[PDB]
Amino acid sequence: VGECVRGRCPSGMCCSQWGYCGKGPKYCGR
């Protein structure tokens, strides 16, 4: 359901290797 738009994040967040959006090293890798 909540996975990255249907492929990306909002213009400022990072899509994790879980396919889910956020910030920090679980999401941006840094």
Side-chain angles (χ1 to χ4, degrees), residues 2-30:
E3 50 292 339
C4 294
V5 179
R6 290 294 85 167
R8 60 160 289 178
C9 271
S11 298
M13 291 179 180
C14 303
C15 192
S16 63
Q17 71 289 84
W18 302 169
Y20 277 64
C21 189
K23 215 72 192 173
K26 180 69 283 304
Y27 288 102
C28 303
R30 182 269 168 277

